[PDB]
Amino acid sequence: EQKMLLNLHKKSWMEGLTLQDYSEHCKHNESVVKEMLELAKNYNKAVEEEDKMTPEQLAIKNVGKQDPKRHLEEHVDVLMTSNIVQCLAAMLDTVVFKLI
Amino acid sequence: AAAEHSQRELDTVTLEDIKEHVKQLEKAVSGKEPRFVLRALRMLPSTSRRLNHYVLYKAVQGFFTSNNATRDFLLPFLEEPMDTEADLQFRPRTGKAASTPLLPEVEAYLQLLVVIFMMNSKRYKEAQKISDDLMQKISTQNRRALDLVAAKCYYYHARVYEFLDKLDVVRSFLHARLRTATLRHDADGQATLLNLLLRNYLHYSLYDQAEKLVSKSVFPEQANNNEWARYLYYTGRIKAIQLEYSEARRTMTNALRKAPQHTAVGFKQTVHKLLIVVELLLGEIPDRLQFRQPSLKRSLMPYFLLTQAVRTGNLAKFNQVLDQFGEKFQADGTYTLIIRLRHNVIKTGVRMISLSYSRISLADIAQKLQLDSPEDAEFIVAKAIRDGVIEASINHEKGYVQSKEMIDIYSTREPQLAFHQRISFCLDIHNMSVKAMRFPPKSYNKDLESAEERREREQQDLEFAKEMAE
Amino acid sequence: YLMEGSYNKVFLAKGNIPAESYTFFIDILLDTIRDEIAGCIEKAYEKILFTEATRILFFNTPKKMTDYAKKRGWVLGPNNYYSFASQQQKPEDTTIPSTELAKQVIEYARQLEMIV
Amino acid sequence: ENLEEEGLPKNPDLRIAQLRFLLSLPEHRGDAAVRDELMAAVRDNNMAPYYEALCKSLDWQIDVDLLNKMKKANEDELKRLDEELEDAEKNLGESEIRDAMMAKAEYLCRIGDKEGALTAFRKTYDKTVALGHRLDIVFYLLRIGLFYMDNDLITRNTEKAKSLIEEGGDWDRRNRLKVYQGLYCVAIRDFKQAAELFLDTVSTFTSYELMDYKTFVTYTVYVSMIALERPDLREKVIKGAEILEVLHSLPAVRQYLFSLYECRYSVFFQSLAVVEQEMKKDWLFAPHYRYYVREMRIHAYSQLLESYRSLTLGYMAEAFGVGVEFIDQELSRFIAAGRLHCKIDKVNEIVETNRPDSKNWQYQETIKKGDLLLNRVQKLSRVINM
Amino acid sequence: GSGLRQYYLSKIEELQLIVNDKSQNLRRLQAQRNELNAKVRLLREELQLLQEQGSYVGEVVRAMDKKKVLVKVHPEGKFVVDVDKNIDINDVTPNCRVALRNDSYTLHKILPNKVDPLVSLMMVEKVPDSTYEMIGG
Amino acid sequence: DDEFEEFPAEDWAGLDEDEDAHVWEDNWDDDNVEDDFSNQLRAELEKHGY
Amino acid sequence: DLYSRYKKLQQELEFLEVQEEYIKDEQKNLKKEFLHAQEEVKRIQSIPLVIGQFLEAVDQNTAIVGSTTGSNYYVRILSTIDRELLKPNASVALHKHSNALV
Amino acid sequence: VRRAAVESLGFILFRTPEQCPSVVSLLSESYNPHVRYGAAMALGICCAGTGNKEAINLLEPMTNDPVN
Amino acid sequence: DKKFHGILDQGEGVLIIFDEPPVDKTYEAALETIQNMSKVVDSLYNKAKKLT
């Protein structure tokens, strides 16, 4: 019964080798890299601001205001997972589905 | 007597400083942590200048407190003060401390302190006798903390012979001591001993001998950054002579990075001078920034003119630098590597020819490279398209060279290859930085619910169940 | 001269040797130079004339080309030209190194997840 | 008629900085006129600390009589200002206190006491409660920064000025800061930003303490030709109503601008040579006079080749009024640098243009600038560990 | 005058260096584990802690004797409450925001002070701030 | 710190008068030794007889 | 005692390998439990939830919230809450019983 | 099984009592109360009758553990 | 004027029109991200040297 339930959310073998649409993959890469462009600009400000910040404001002043460092990591994590999988799956498909 | 008052005021504080370091050495043995020795040797360059003849005498006769053969050895080699008014008896050892012999950890330090000043007074013959007497002391002993002291002693032991211009009798001592350090896994001594041997070999142009040693011996990974800097320079110099330019450039760049950030100007100059040649010997272009630094501007000027000559890729300007700064390069130990730059001047000159001309006459190529005859340019271009320097073809009957149409660089694997070495290096920095994150040994699970405060809820919750339900 | 390709001066080095003792090692070098010069020609010249390569290879008699030609396997043309069509063996960008690239991209994922 | 009266105070007088630079040149060291006008500024304003540095760096003979009469008045005036500050701090109010230490700062800045002026201005800023008065001190520090090319002073105060203009929406001061920023951008070879800032303030220029309006438009045209595309140049500079009006009284600069736009390459090279000598003698454009002329030559060669598939060497030599050998050497240098998208067929003397994609140029910059960034990251980790 | 004393000590010192390396490494690994373990432990206890009833927000009228304070709970009028042993009665100033326990209404935390009534009065009036530089004539 | 007194520190003899003191994207092309463009153009205007 | 020291060191080294193997194993399973602890904490967010207003953040984990019932409370904040969303005048769901910011 | 796994450590280490308060010390503070109980019992089994100060110093905070 | 992309062949008297690709804004954003990330490294440098 445990192995049977492990089939929940188990994707089909087609999806593993399925390549994401390259037009949208570049567009997603386009958008997120642009998002980090503003975040990097804000990240510089956060470094100088936190240099002159009392230790009581390390968390209170971060409440309600977006953290450039936190979103930068999420954008980096998403892009590197997205591109590595797209590259690896593409490289696998070039030999697996080979006409020769 | 204003000078005497100030000097004596400066003398006593130095004596306290020497007293401070020894207690770190003694507490290193007491605590059984050899790393405590480093803070005494951390200030060793500072104290080396802050000591005079009077400073030495008070320490040597005031710290031993036992008139063994040691006090009969180093006292006669230093001048003694007269019957000063402030006869402050500097005796850190009292009672049983005075009777007990000094530790081999500490007695090596003062003896090294003596041998440093004998170098500053240019008493190399007298310094040699003291250093030779010193090296009997550490050779016999087998302590673990003394090895950290021993590494500094070996450095100055090669230094006293450096000013004696022998440098050969130390090779047997350095090699023998290296095995003693290697078999004991003395990382600090082994790193210094290997560096001193390479300097020994390179001083006599024993580049073959030094290459063999670095091929078999393994430099300590857990070595001082100052010893890593010397090793990377010495290895890089070896590789440059052995036509291993690519590995040479990486090492000297690493040696520059590990060099001290505010001192060791002379070492930066020497490494910069060799790295400029290697980068030119590798076909790359030296960074323009390094010639702008105040410390390197005057020293790198002959190499700045040489870099300019190589960059334009004309034999005429390259030879002018050689005929103008040949003596400077010879005294700099870089003349022989400069001579090979003539091939790079031709190579980069041909590279600009193909990069700019779709079809150029061989007589013209001889003019742009200032070669002898177009027949000579015919052979020179012939290898360049064989070695892959330029992509072109020669029409012997017509007499020109036809450069190949440039291929789309972004449509091949080269951008991936360039990114791969950049991506893997960034991923290496992150792993290196994460592994360097240290957590202090704070009392964990103490920020949880306190025993007394958690007990408050249970009693209050009991009344909540005993009253609301009823 | 050998490194920069001044093969003209390498053969001219015979005449201006410093002493009579140096002769032996010069000929040993000159045998290596002969293959090195022709090694350029295959990748340099797309076709070079018969007696045109006589001075390039520093061959005295035309017969000394014939034995060297078959040793190097040079297909002589009817117009006294050697056809060196061999650049077709390009670096072979026709093939994507999928296994090598897949090996590298996997290593990136390892350096991101294996760290823990 | 009141244009110069609208500008901020001329402290430090940036003309002295140009005069000091001119004497540093080997060509103009012995110029009596430049020496006389500099000495007139020193004598009039009693710049005793500046006279010491002027005589030390240029190896001059210090007039003891002139120096002593200038030092005495500096002591007398500094004593007067110290007395005024003492009187203000005991009887008058805080505003009169601030005006007392302000005048001390300007006098120190006027006489060339740079270190004293910075300290005095810092103390004045601490107890200056008016926002615009605070921003005048910052503009004073920016002028001091430009006078000595103190990049740390300029960058810090430019950032401070930006903050102050945000709190109080002073568009007038904002326009002045662009001229200040543009002058620094010229000094640091940022012609792309200098052109943008200058063109914004070409119709709002009131910073006469830095330069004349004719000189400002001259700089605006110069930075525009090297940093603006052809469509951007025609809308802003060629058809600029404010620039065209000034160019009526500046026939040389107008000829330089329109020669390239109207594809008159022979005249443009003649004008570029004239422009080159102006920028060599100009303290702001001197470090970049070689770079600017080279880039402008690259622009002219690229503009001529842009519309044609192949141009013969003789035609290009004829177009620029130069020899074939000159055009061959210039092209081969620029093509090797990767700045010209063409190749020369020297046997037939034909230059054939290429069209490389923007992806390649972007990739090299990413490799270049990324490697520069990576070197900082590697170096910073080295500082962290030890 | 020794046997394998040199051989034994060579073996012993070889182990001591290896032992010291692993003890240094183990303490690094143990600290990594302890931080994760406390983070897990704090999370499980947080679920129980979040179920504890929240504290009222009150305004201090005036402190009284015997560690008593007169507070105004926001909707529920005035109370006379005790003060937690970790709160100093001298720090309980009038017109201060304090947190009172759910059942006992005990003053246990001095919340950040509210807006000064004078400040609030000047926000609604909103007189434009002026300096001498923006006055002409 | 173990400073490198072993290596011969060649005397500075440098110009402490702010020789360059600049921060640009400096490249090697500005240091090429050549006459000013005015001299180059003036040396070629008369080469054509003008 | 020279052999005993050598053997005692050998056991102490071997024990260190055992300890360092179990710490790495525990870290693997502690990461599993952290995700489980994060997941089981979300039951504090089960409906129904009274809606409050975020007024002020006293510290990292506590805040002052104004419940729609009309009372201001000093409560705790769930650690799994994106504090970037705790803007002034932000609608927040409070635990129906404990008024905690969930 | 986890509680018995820690408990079984005491039977292996009683001959060398000083070693249990080091292997079990970290398990004494674990998130799992059963492992914490096992660490307590492991100290009791291994250090039985020894009066080990280190083992007792571990158990003293345990006597106020949240879990009964 | 960049009104259309092409080149003129004077010798043959023909106009060669080109279908240029739009610039890759991903590289444009990547380049300025590197520039803005460099300023962060500058800021982390001041924090690194001043606090240690």
Side-chain angles (χ1 to χ4, degrees), chain C:
Chain C
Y1 290 170
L2 182 44
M3 228 208 308
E4 58 212 64
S6 284
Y7 298 118
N8 162 340
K9 274 86 172 293
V10 191
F11 282 91
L12 258 281
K14 176 79 64 43
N16 54 346
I17 61 63
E20 196 27 70
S21 316
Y22 285 42
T23 165
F24 179 35
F25 296 143
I26 277 305
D27 316 279
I28 314 166
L29 192 44
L30 272 41
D31 324 302
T32 39
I33 308 329
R34 212 155 248 102
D35 250 23
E36 285 283 347
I37 286 190
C40 312
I41 288 175
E42 331 170 290
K43 297 205 181 310
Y45 292 106
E46 43 88 344
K47 61 175 271 323
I48 164 169
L49 183 148
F50 175 82
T51 175
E52 194 85 316
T54 307
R55 73 214 72 92
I56 309 301
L57 270 274
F58 294 85
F59 268 153
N60 237 42
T61 312
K63 149 252 301 193
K64 330 222 271 183
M65 253 284 195
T66 55
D67 35 9
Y68 184 79
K70 40 196 178 260
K71 287 167 188 177
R72 207 89 209 251
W74 276 10
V75 178
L76 185 53
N79 324 55
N80 326 62
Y81 282 113
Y82 309 99
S83 323
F84 297 111
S86 180
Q87 314 90 359
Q88 303 91 23
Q89 295 293 334
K90 296 168 297 300
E92 305 301 89
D93 281 18
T94 320
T95 59
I96 297 159
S98 325
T99 326
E100 279 195 349
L101 284 191
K103 232 167 289 273
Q104 288 174 24
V105 155
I106 276 171
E107 245 297 331
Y108 308 171
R110 280 172 27 99
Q111 292 162 23
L112 300 161
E113 313 271 320
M114 140 186 66
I115 170 62
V116 296

Side-chain angles (χ1 to χ4, degrees), chain B residues 350-392:
Chain B
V350 162
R351 196 121 40 75
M352 305 189 324
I353 286 268
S354 85
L355 206 57
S356 148
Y357 292 93
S358 181
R359 185 159 36 199
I360 194 179
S361 156
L362 279 152
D364 265 19
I365 285 186
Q367 186 264 343
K368 316 214 145 283
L369 308 188
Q370 284 311 256
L371 304 181
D372 310 29
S373 66
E375 292 79 6
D376 251 4
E378 161 134 47
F379 295 108
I380 283 187
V381 169
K383 177 151 29 44
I385 48 205
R386 175 183 71 122
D387 282 342
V389 172
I390 62 159
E391 282 298 287

Side-chain angles (χ1 to χ4, degrees), chain B residues 252-279:
Chain B
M252 328 210 59
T253 315
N254 265 85
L256 264 206
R257 209 177 302 119
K258 273 164 162 302
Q261 310 217 185
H262 297 318
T263 170
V265 152
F267 174 74
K268 295 184 182 87
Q269 285 168 18
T270 285
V271 174
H272 266 284
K273 296 222 235 293
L274 200 43
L275 185 52
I276 285 160
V277 184
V278 169
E279 287 210 344

Side-chain angles (χ1 to χ4, degrees), chain E residues 4 6 20 22-23 28 35-36 38-39 41-42 49 52 54 87 94 99 105 110 124 126 132 136:
Chain E
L4 301 322
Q6 216 38 66
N20 286 0
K22 281 180 138 65
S23 34
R28 185 193 46 91
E35 158 90 29
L36 189 38
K39 169 198 307 333
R41 277 247 263 172
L42 219 75
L49 257 78
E52 278 178 356
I87 292 263
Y105 282 68
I110 307 265
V124 40
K126 198 133 137 173
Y132 294 141

Side-chain angles (χ1 to χ4, degrees), chain F:
Chain F
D1 50 345
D2 309 328
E3 71 94 357
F4 290 51
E5 82 155 40
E6 145 204 355
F7 276 107
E10 154 166 4
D11 65 57
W12 287 40
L15 293 323
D16 295 331
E17 53 253 35
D18 292 86
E19 34 191 4
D20 267 326
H22 66 69
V23 52
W24 322 318
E25 54 268 354
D26 66 331
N27 59 306
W28 278 98
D29 313 283
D30 325 306
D31 301 317
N32 180 16
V33 46
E34 40 166 32
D35 352 294
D36 285 349
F37 174 61
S38 324
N39 298 347
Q40 294 213 261
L41 191 68
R42 191 211 323 292
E44 257 215 333
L45 199 70
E46 88 294 18
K47 234 152 67 169
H48 301 83
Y50 304 139

Side-chain angles (χ1 to χ4, degrees), chain B residues 319-352:
Chain B
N319 291 10
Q320 181 264 127
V321 157
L322 254 178
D323 308 6
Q324 215 174 257
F325 299 120
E327 298 206 13
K328 164 64 83 43
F329 298 149
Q330 288 163 11
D332 253 19
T334 46
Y335 182 84
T336 44
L337 297 144
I338 284 324
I339 307 330
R340 326 168 182 186
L341 268 193
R342 109 177 308 270
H343 172 48
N344 282 99
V345 163
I346 279 168
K347 216 149 55 63
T348 196
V350 162
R351 196 121 40 75
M352 305 189 324

